[PDB]
Design a protein around this ligand. Structure first.
Ligand SMILES: O=C(O)CCC(=O)C(=O)O
Ligand SMILES: [Mn+2]
Ligand SMILES: [Mn+2]
Length: 190
């Protein structure tokens, strides 16, 4: 339902490395995050785009000070996705416009440890993972609003990830129309 792959072996190999938990958040939790983050994101302009930037059509913030309700959600993510690992001192909040997208990349190994965990809000999208040496090994993850994904180990180090732009936004054969998306990303310390 939420993962498709280039073949059975990549699917088995990454089954606990690339994880989607649809409906990890309740509607109330989605609302908590939106009410806290929408106003903060509105204070910033969508950034200038660059050809050699991974992220296109976006604004963002780092946030370490959170309401108690949002902190309860972040602690649920930490329990679900991270061992005992330490998290970075801030959480990355990313606002992609409907025309925005993310190009294939591997998160910096200088600043991010073994695990990335992301909450998706507002609208559905498709995350594609592609092996960095072998373009024939890939996964597609369907990220609906309220979902948590986890990329760890090989899914974090050996595969790029990207968020498909509207015209390319397909989960298998199915078109996933893109809208404005907010994501809330927790990362481990290296
Ligand atoms: O929006 C997401 O879920 C991922 C963002 C991302 O890949 C990044 O900021 O490195
Ligand atoms: Mn920025
Ligand atoms: Mn990334």
């Amino acid at each position: 339902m939420w993962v498709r792959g280039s073949g059975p072996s990549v699917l088995s190999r990454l089954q606990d490395a690339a994880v989607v938990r649809p409906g990890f958040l309740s509607t109330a939790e989605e609302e908590t995050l939106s009410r806290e983050l929408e106003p903060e994101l509105r204070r910033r302009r969508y950034e200038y785009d660059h050809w050699d930037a991974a992220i296109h059509g976006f604004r963002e913030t780092e946030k370490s000070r959170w309401s108690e309700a949002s902190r309860a959600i972040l602690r649920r993510v930490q329990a679900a996705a991270f061992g005992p690992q330490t998290l970075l001192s801030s959480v990355h909040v990313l606002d992609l416009e409907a025309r925005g997208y993310i190009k294939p990349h591997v998160d910096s190994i200088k600043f991010c440890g073994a695990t990335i965990a992301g909450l998706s809000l507002l609208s559905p999208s498709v995350m594609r993972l592609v092996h960095t040496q072998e373009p024939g090994e890939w996964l597609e993850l369907l990220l609906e609003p309220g979902s948590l994904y986890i990329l760890r180990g090989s899914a974090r180090y050996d595969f790029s990830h990207e968020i498909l732009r509207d015209e390319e936004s397909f989960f298998g054969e199915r078109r996933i129309p893109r809208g404005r998306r907010i994501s809330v990303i927790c990362r481990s310390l290296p």
